Amino acid sequence: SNAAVVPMPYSPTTVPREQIREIQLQLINEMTDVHMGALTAQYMPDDFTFEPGIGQIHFNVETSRKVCLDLAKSVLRLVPVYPLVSPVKKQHDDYWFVGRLGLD
């Protein structure tokens, strides 16, 4: 029965984490130039790495790569084109190395 299967086990810290997500959303809405980078509520215990003692508290490698891709896509969305500009715009062959006395 699909009614009784639950994707994630019970943990006492789930509710405070939801409240912190809400408060961060409030900060995003009420502040300037603040955006959402990546969404990590999707990932399930199969993704995390188990450790002796405390277990399932840190990401795997693959999930880290996925989150980094999400962050890169978000940052590119904010800044589609390369902003910086360089005074030298041609190859070295075009320029002619000359020496001058003091300007004017």
Positions that interact with other proteins (CB under 8 A):
1-6, 8-14, 16-17, 19-21, 23-24, 26-28, 31, 33-41, 43, 45, 48, 50, 52-59, 61, 64-65, 67-69, 71-76, 78, 81-82
**Which residue lies nearer to other proteins by CB, 12 or 87?**
12
Write the DSSP assignment of 70-88 as a string of letters: HHHHHHHHH--S-----S-
Taking the complex as a whole, how short is the minimal distance between the CB of residue 14 and other proteins, in angstroms?
A: 7
Report which of 76, 78, 42, 77 is spatially closest to residue 62, judged by C-alpha positions.
Answer: 42
Taking the complex as a whole, how short is the minimal distance between the CB of residue 80 and other proteins, in angstroms?
A: 9
Angstrom distance (rounded) from CA 99 to CA 16: 68
